[PDB]
Every structure is written in structure tokens, then in C-alpha cells.
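Hi team,

Filling in the usual template for the complex we talked about on Friday. All components are listed, including any nucleic acid strands or ligand strings, so the model treats them as one assembly.

SUBMITTER: L.P.
PURPOSE: interface mapping
COMPONENTS: two
RESIDUES: 98
SEQUENCES:
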Amino acid sequence: KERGASLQHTAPFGCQIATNPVRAVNCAVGNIPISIDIPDAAFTRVVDA
Amino acid sequence: PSVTDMSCEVPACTHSSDFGGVAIIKYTASKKGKCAVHSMTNAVTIREA
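RESULT (copied from the run log):
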């Protein structure tokens, strides 16, 4: 009864939390590095373009 | 055949063991025929003769 607002409503940065299992979805915090090792079949030489 | 209005553009070049340089030469000729290509500079070698 005197439980107050859950973390679903009070957590900053718009985190959406689901359970079974417990997880925090779409917490807009910081940035992220992504590395792509692209194969060589996808590329076309400048002269062919 | 004789030629005129020759221009040379290198859209992509990489100094490597393989043919890493490609050059597109726009020209105007006079008639159809076989022409020899030769580099007057020793630092460049063309695969096609």
C-alpha cells in the first residue's frame, strides 16, 4: 500500500524495465563503439563505379 | 593512327606489387589501328603493351 512509484516510472533516462528475466531496455546513456570487418566481395573499384 | 587531345586521369592508385594504379586516358584519334603504349619514366610500368 505505501509502496510508492516503482522503478518503471521513476528511473531516469527513460529506462523501460521488464521482468522474467529482469532487464533494463533502452537506457539512453553514453555512446557505443562498433567495429565492422567488412569482406572484400562487397567492394567495387572506383573505375568499375 | 595519330592522336590528339589526350588527357590522363588516375581515379585510384595504390603503390603495391600488383597493378594498384589505374589510369583512364581520354583521347581523340584519327583512324582504327594498333598503338604501342610506353612509359618514358622508369618508375611506372604498364601491364598492357
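MY TAKE: Residues 4 and 48 of chain B are 21 Å apart (CA to CA). Chain B is about 0% helix and 40% strand.

Thanks, L.
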